[PDB]
Design a protein around this nucleic acid. Structure first.
Lengths: 118, 112, 123, 69, 93, 144, 114, 48, 53
RNA sequence: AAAUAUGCAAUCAAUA
RNA sequence: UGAUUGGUAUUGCAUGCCUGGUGACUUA
């Protein structure tokens, strides 16, 4: 599941006039490794109150502070999300989800991690 | 409508650079004329009140405060304009959605 | 003694200030996930040592913990005083519902709870 | 780095001027009293600070406040 | 070549007002002509307001590019009367 | 009076004239701020390109202009092996008022110029979602 | 100084002091931040962080010829070596379905692998 | 003074200052309310 | 310390030196054509709508 | 009772 | 007290932005 999932309809949708893929910058050192982008997906299982409204607000606040993008989805017993942003921001979000959540978090899982995105 | 041949997503026009609007230009002309002739109208009214006569002042028809209308600054439309914004519905919407009002206390999360 | 009791709370305040100074910084101070590892500052070992030991900060926190645990006695005393200050003295079927038998379900935009009924139709 | 060093030098110079030509009784009280010695000392200190204020390379705003600089 | 450096009025390192009045920055030949004409007449242009400067610039441009019949003012007012008033208000030093 | 601070603003919002409520507007400031933003975004990069075009006679021109203006030209070039870096700058266009506030950042300015920086990680006029600030893409559109 | 009973029990059941465990976790978080992981060298004087290594995304394998990482897909048998299999696309077609709003298009493909 | 974060000035001084402030506020409100007008400059029975 | 008791920035010698520096700058600009452009370059600001159109 | 001569909102005691 | 690069002419069956009506939005 993802917010960017769509089914092809019967009417034309404007396509990009051309195709150009920006290159991946592989010459990154300690002086430039902080400018790289990244993405990951997270799943949390446990117990949350108000059908996950509290966790939703907390995650939205953290993402607004960290300038992260993507989407989240919290419910009574689970939470899922797809997060994208700077590497340091992603690491901070991972630490927050692992240790700084004010609800019962029985299990945490991270998957589909990618770095160096243009 | 489900457009059969959708076009490209166009970049919106500049906020601070409206297109030519002769109506807005004439409104500015009227504003400046009133600013220049405001004292003379006061003199007219002083003279008439001293003489105790309720006479008309025809030149005010052309150089008066009431020839001025609140026109949208970014759109040029002359209706639905508030002093607190000086802009019409669409001008206000574009300004708010571009993020120019966050500094000035605008709270998009408030309905009432 | 009189002077001992006079100075007891001032010295306790000094101790509390020390605890506050220690706690006002991150646990692994000055370690950091940035300049600390990416921009180290040999001939300069006298003014800046790249080497670092964690036992010092660990011992500092170990000594700090019991002091705050003891300072919790201040909270216990304050709670005791607060409870005592409200002492009174010698000792002297079907459901009931208000504002509907049950809460009403809304399928239209509620003027009050718009933040929860926004997705619903306005008519 | 040179601009920061100049700012620190300017702050040090301002502190030295403050200690060298202190205004007895407070600036407001000195101004209200309007004594010749107080006015002379304040003017001397102000002119010395103005003369010693540097001209940085990376900023085009010559801030007279060492805090701001 | 290049524009002449501005003269700071007092306690300053630059002055955009002088450049604007002389029409050097932003460059505007009509404003340069207005400045030259007012200087020749004997009006201290630097002491004038933006409104008066723009009005004189527009009047001069219209007169030059449409004829001596223009500009035309109501109530039997004349460009010569305007120039005399400006000269009286801002004597040239 | 069950919710006082929740309704705190209601009185001013509903039953007070704007001219007597004390609420301070924003039009007369944002009007200049938007034009400042556009002017800077349009002129800064071109100024930097013009500065870096030659990149060899910059110091010579600075030396000659210092001779013309100050007559010494040793403030920036004490000796032949000293390098004077040029920071791009643009004219200040928004008529801010000089104030006695000693902490004002744009009251001690005397040159009529401000340093310009091409780098800003945080975009200031953050739009909502995909929207782009108007006047950002000048390339003509292409239709299918 | 005799350790407290709680500290002794925690050491017995974990082998480290509560502070030791907390600081180990914090140090691990601080070191394994961003896109790289730092390595620690310990001596008499203390610890230091002088080298870093790129972090390897989970469940991905680096392909030499591509020079990039490729994900590991579930359902596939990991014993099978995908570098010695090849594929051919026999046919791809644009199938159609009907819903309330109209017609929905998806695609079908037939592929041979050996 | 003795307690940290509290104003060091005299409580009676503060009381006198507050009473003066309240009195001047009442006077300002009275004057403003009396002098307020929707059509400023208009006086009844004067040539309108 | 204080500044100049009698600054020489208002002296005929200073004015003559300024004129000489101006002449030197003009001569250098005439001699070098790249420097001439790099010195006389000007850039006007125009409307983004005008740019689009 | 030699006290009072009594109708209620949508702002303000962090100041009436 | 700092004005401007034509058209409120057709084409919303070319479009962008923005709206109305009807449908949906379920996971561990």
């Amino acid at each position: 599941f993802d917010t960017l999932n769509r089914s092809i309809t019967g009417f034309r949708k404007y396509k990009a006039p051309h195709t150009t893929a920006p290159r991946v910058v592989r010459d990154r050192d300690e002086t430039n490794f902080h400018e790289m982008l990244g993405k990951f997906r997270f799943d949390l299982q446990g117990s949350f109150k108000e059908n996950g409204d509290m966790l939703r607000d907390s995650l939205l606040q953290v993402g607004r502070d960290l300038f992260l993008v993507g989407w989240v989805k919290c419910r009574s017993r689970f939470a899922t999300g797809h997060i994208q942003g700077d590497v340091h921001a992603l690491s901070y979000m991972r630490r927050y989800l692992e240790k700084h959540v004010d609800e019962s978090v029985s299990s945490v899982r991270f998957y589909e991690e990618n770095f160096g995105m243009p | 409508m489900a457009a059969r041949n959708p076009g490209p997503v166009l970049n919106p026009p500049p906020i601070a650079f409206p297109s030519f609007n002769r109506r807005c230009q004439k409104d500015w002309l009227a504003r400046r004329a009133f600013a220049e002739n405001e004292v003379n109208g006061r003199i007219y009214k002083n003279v008439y009140q001293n003489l105790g006569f309720k006479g008309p002042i025809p030149i005010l028809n052309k150089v008066g405060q009431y020839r001025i209308r609140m026109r949208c600054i970014s759109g040029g439309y002359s209706r639905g304009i508030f002093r607190f914004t000086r802009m019409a519905r669409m001008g206000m919407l574009q300004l708010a959605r571009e993020g120019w009002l966050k500094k000035y206390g605008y709270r998009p999360g408030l309905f009432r | 003694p009189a002077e001992r009791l006079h100075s007891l709370f001032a010295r306790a305040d000094v101790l509390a200030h020390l605890l506050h100074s220690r706690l006002a910084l991150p646990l692994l101070y000055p370690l950091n996930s940035g300049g600390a590892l990416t921009n180290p500052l040999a001939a300069l070992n006298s003014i800046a040592t790249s080497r670092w030991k964690r036992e010092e900060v660990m011992s500092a926190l170990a000594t700090v913990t019991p002091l705050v645990l003891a300072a919790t006695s201040v909270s216990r005393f304050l709670k005791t005083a607060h409870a005592l200050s409200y002492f009174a003295g010698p000792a002297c079927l079907g459901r009931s519902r208000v504002h509907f038998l049950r809460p009403q379900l809304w399928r239209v935009l509620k003027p009050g709870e718009e933040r929860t009924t926004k997705h619903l139709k306005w008519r | 780095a040179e601009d920061l060093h100049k700012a620190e030098i300017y702050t040090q110079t301002t502190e030295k001027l403050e200690k060298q030509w202190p205004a007895a009784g407070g600036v407001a009280k000195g101004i209200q009293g309007d004594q010749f010695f107080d006015v002379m000392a304040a003017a001397v200190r102000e002119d010395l600070q103005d003369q010693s204020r540097p001209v940085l390379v990376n900023e085009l705003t010559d801030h007279e406040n060492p805090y701001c600089m | 070549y290049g524009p002449e450096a501005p003269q700071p009025p007092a306690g300053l390192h630059w002055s955009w007002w002088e450049l604007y009045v002389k029409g050097v920055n932003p460059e505007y030949p009509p404003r340069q002509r207005m400045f030259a004409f007012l200087t020749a007449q004997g009006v201290d242009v630097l002491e004038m307001e933006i409104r008066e400067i723009e009005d004189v610039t527009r009047w001069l441009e219209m007169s030059n590019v449409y004829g001596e019949k223009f500009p035309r003012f109501p109530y039997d007012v004349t460009f010569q009367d305007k120039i005399e008033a400006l000269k009286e208000k801002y004597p040239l030093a | 009076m069950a919710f006082r601070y929740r309704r705190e603003g209601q009185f001013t919002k509903f039953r007070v004239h704007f001219d007597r409520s004390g609420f301070r507007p924003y039009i007369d400031e944002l009007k200049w701020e938007i034009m400042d933003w556009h002017y800077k975004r349009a002129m800064g990069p071109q100024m930097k390109k013009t500065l870096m075009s030659y990149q060899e006679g910059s110091e010579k021109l600075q030396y000659m202009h210092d001779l013309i203006a100050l007559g010494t030209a040793k403030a920036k070039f004490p000796h032949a092996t000293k390098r004077f870096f040029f920071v791009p700058a643009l004219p200040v266009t928004i008529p801010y008022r000089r104030s006695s506030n000693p902490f004002c950042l744009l009251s001690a300015n005397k040159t009529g110029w401000l340093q310009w920086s091409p780098k800003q990680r945080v975009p200031f006029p953050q739009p909502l979602g995909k929207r782009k600030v108007g006047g950002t893409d000048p390339q003509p559109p292409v239709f299918p | 100084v005799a350790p407290s009973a709680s500290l002794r029990n925690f050491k017995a059941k974990f082998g480290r002091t509560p502070l030791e465990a907390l600081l180990d976790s914090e140090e691990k978080f601080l070191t394994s931040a961003g896109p790289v992981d730092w390595l620690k060298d310990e001596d008499e004087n203390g610890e230091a962080f002088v080298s870093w290594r790129w972090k390897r995304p989970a469940q991905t394998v680096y392909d030499a010829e591509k020079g990039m990482f490729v994900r590991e897909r579930e359902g596939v048998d990991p014993l099978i070596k995908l570098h010695e299999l090849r594929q051919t696309l026999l046919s791809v077609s644009r199938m159609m379905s009907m819903n309330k709003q109209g017609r929905v298009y998806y695609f079908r493909a037939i592929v041979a692998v050996g | 003074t003795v307690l940290r974060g509290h104003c060091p000035t005299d409580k009676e001084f503060i009381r006198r200052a507050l009473e003066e402030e309240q009195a001047v506020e009442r006077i300002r409100k009275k004057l403003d309310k009396k002098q307020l007008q929707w059509f400023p400059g208009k006086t009844p029975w004067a040539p309108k | 310390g204080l500044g100049d008791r009698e600054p020489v920035q208002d002296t005929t010698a200073f004015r003559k030196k300024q004129e000489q520096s101006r002449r030197t700058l003009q001569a250098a600009l005439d001699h070098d054509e790249r420097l001439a452009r790099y010195h006389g370059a000007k850039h006007r600001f125009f409307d983004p709508l005008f740019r689009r159109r």
